[PDB]
Design a binder for this molecule. Sequence first.
Ligand SMILES: NC(=O)C[C@H]1CCc2sc3ncnc(O[C@H]4CC[C@H](N5CCOCC5)CC4)c3c21
Length: 272
Amino acid sequence: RFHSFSFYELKNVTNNFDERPISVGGNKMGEGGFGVVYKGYVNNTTVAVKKLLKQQFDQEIKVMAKCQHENLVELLGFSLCLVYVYMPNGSLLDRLSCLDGTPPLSWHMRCKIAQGAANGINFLHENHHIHRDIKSANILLDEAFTAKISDFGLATVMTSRIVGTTAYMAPEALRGEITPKSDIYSFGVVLLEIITGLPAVDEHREPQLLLDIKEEIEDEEKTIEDYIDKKMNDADSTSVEAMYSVASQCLHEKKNKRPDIKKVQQLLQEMT
Ligand SMILES: NC(=O)C[C@H]1CCc2sc3ncnc(O[C@H]4CC[C@H](N5CCOCC5)CC4)c3c21
């Protein structure tokens, strides 16, 4: 169960919700889609307090109650505020872009993160849950750089309101179709970010969308080697080509042609 926390019990921990950076001496880290994530303390135990939508608050708690795994973030409590075990190495997105002078992730580290994330998605799917917002900003990293999937506020059926990040969304997801296959597509984009070290979308880039590179490689214009993150010293053609092959398979426009998360895990496992 999650501890019954009051707004008062969680206002003090955040230093009356101090909206200043930690690098200068504050309590604000950054935003998290539907809120702001603040650094907190519950008896010499660092926590992540997410101040935020009411139904999305309710959905995180329901999914978190049913799903406990090595590769999912941990919900400790709630009050609107949600309390989690603090991920000291922030998001995969921040680490791929070396935000705040953090050193680049090695190829070895990237393979472990890719494997962990897939174990996380597999656990969710095995428990009949579709994430609906798989992206590098939602893949957090612990003290050992373990990938932990987060943001279950949005977790074949059609919907009136299309929700998720467009740069990561599957064609059918953008058309309002909810399927676990959409999560596979979104994971394929994350694998492209791992290989390239590039964000899924950059308005000041040619191509603006990262999944457009899949078509430059497919139509023999370029190769995966021309796009490998130059901030690595340990990558090898074989494992890089193996991870690209998985991403390519994930990024099929036809949902039935994409692999299931179990086949994805297996392929990433074979890779190492
Ligand atoms: N899905 C999420 O929103 C992550 C939340 C929910 C569950 C948890 S557990 C946890 N532990 C640590 N940080 C956390 O989110 C930080 C949010 C700001 C980020 N920023 C981007 C801009 O630049 C600064 C960093 C870095 C990560 C979290 C989170």
